Scaffold this active site. Structure first.
Site, PDB file in Angstrom:
ATOM      1  N   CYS A   1      85.329 -14.969  19.133  1.00 56.29           N
ATOM      2  CA  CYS A   1      84.845 -16.313  19.478  1.00 56.29           C
ATOM      3  C   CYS A   1      83.452 -16.191  20.084  1.00 56.29           C
ATOM      4  O   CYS A   1      83.263 -15.624  21.161  1.00 56.29           O
ATOM      5  CB  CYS A   1      85.845 -16.965  20.400  1.00 56.29           C
TER       6      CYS A   1
ATOM      7  N   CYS B   1      82.607 -18.259  23.199  1.00 53.61           N
ATOM      8  CA  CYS B   1      83.223 -17.603  24.334  1.00 53.61           C
ATOM      9  C   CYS B   1      82.297 -16.590  24.965  1.00 53.61           C
ATOM     10  O   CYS B   1      82.324 -16.422  26.179  1.00 53.61           O
ATOM     11  CB  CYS B   1      84.567 -16.913  23.912  1.00 53.61           C
TER      12      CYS B   1
END
Length: 105
Positions: A30, A33
């Site tokens: 991700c 993230c």
């Protein structure tokens, strides 16, 4: 400074915490993230007395992310006394700062 959570340890670490808790729900794939992760670390260091900071790999631990309706990532939850103070959806630096402050206040 950042606690690594499991499904088995979530209740104890987060729900029963005496201080407010920031939970970063994340995964290795991700990209956004990784954008929010340094803010999370920075908050962990900045609020070391007053805030528990923890993270949960949604691929390793699927039970709790599912109970909290974590649909997309990054999602960050601020907890206090077992309750959710706010849900931050996406790498929303401002909202994350503000929600932490509310909890600690």
């Amino acid at each position: 400074d950042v606690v690594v959570l499991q499904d088995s340890t979530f209740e104890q670490e987060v729900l029963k915490s005496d201080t407010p808790v920031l939970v970063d729900f994340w995964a290795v794939w991700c990209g956004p993230c990784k954008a929010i992760a340094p803010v999370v670390d920075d908050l962990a260091a900045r609020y070391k007395g007053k805030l528990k900071v923890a993270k949960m790999d949604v691929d390793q631990h699927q039970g709790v992310p599912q109970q909290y309706g974590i649909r997309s990532i990054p999602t960050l939850l601020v907890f206090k006394g077992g309750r959710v103070v706010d849900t931050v959806i996406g790498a929303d630096k401002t909202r994350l700062e503000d929600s932490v402050k509310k909890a600690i206040g």
